[PDB]
Amino acid sequence: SGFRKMAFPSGKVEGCMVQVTCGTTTLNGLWLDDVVYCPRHVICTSEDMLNPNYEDLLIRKSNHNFLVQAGNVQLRVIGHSMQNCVLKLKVDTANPKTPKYKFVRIQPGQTFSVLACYNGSPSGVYQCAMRPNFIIKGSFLNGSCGSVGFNIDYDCVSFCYMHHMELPTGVHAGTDLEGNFYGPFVDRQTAQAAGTDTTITVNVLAWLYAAVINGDRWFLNRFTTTLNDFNLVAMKYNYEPLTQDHVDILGPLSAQTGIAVLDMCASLKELLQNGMNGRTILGSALLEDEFTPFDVVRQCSGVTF
């Protein structure tokens, strides 16, 4: 037993990380089959970033202007094109370590692992949520751009995120692997702000179930509530409203624990109204919202890959 924020094993992703250099700018790329995916802002100077016309900047770039280095070996780039906010560099060698993979656009509230890289070399790995306002709160230093986020289902890696920007507020923004940004963000150094940060209610509930399963139950109270009643309360605390789908999704946890979803909602309500009074739940003094219901099930039954 015991419950941790756990990333997926990163080996399959490690073998896909390369270094992409164009002009003075170096960042990370993802080498799958004979294509290297990286942020298009690889082509920009720091001055360019204030107001780039990527189409114009791209005109002055040829295949030979993109140095792609996989460990100590130079890849020959035989073609390139822009797809939304990513570059696809066609290279002449298929990555021999290409895993079974998908590209997936994840929903707000869903979680994934980030393999933070610099100069195409991995630094570390950690679990993240795509927040309701479409930012993530990661750890991304200079050079980290092109680092990816992913899930694994057995042998298949689903890539969902590529890092592109740190906003003035210190939060992080990026795209799916087709290069469309999560949220309204653009690949320009301007004032952009994320909206109100809201908590992923369904995730908090899952985490409370994980707690109970693990012996933390001091927070279980004698009340129940209704979806509408609970949601009134959720609104005030900037919690995402809870829907019947969310309830359905929590069913297996409800069943395992014998605690009806709405009874757990009532426990959550008291916690929002009265706080934790200096206590903890699974070694946290606040309500953790970076575990999905599936994450909880996955850990609590020990699914492997």
Add this chain to the structure above:
Amino acid sequence: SGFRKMAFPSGKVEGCMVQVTCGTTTLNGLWLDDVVYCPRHVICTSEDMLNPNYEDLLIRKSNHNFLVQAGNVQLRVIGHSMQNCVLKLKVDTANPKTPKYKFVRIQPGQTFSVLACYNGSPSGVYQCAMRPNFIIKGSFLNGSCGSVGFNIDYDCVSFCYMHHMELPTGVHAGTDLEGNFYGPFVDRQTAQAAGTDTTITVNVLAWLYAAVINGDRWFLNRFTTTLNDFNLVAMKYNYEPLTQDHVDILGPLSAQTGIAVLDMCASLKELLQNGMNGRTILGSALLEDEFTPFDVVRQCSGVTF
């Protein structure tokens, strides 16, 4: 910027995980060169675990009684011996994925990554501290035994932990890779308890430095203190006493931030005396002690492997 509890990339360790089965018991082993390391309690029934004589139980086991399976391939076991609380199974094939490695006995307060495995397959990876009372608080389900903890320095993996026991209290105990337990624990299902859980003061300080570097400085106050003064306070809050060595170790962070170690100690003192008043530091409502000073430096400058 931004600051996360980050594990080391796990690829190098993944390629060393196997499944060890003896009788009805299956767990994980670490395959390095031509040796598989696993917990000796692989040889025990659940009844045996109440009071095992490992020497006697071992007498009835031959090489052929240990099924070692690396992915889908059976390894031939050509020798076996007991070293403290681990078995070393000599197999006839060197692991072709053996990385540069060391075995190291870590000190209390030091951190490492755990690759949680079941049936020799990885589940996930997360960062841990060896606590002052020699337990870790992990996530280890049935079958997880033999999962390892490690650090990486560039290409060299330093293995420091193998999981063996969950205590009645839900905390976890294990050995170094020579099979000596951290702390007083034994590989028997009896009442054993860890002592008083104390906080790793030097780590809390490092984390406060990480905070400041990242823009969280609301907790900086106008006071300083002395080692002795601070320690009086530390005693009361069950914080490990701070020594001159710890101060020395924090020097680079002191220098980068321009905040003297003893001034940061005074900030910490007020936090212990007055709590956080419902505020957070790097998105935590309590004092995080699972980052070493080196961890902080490592992340804040983006060291790769």
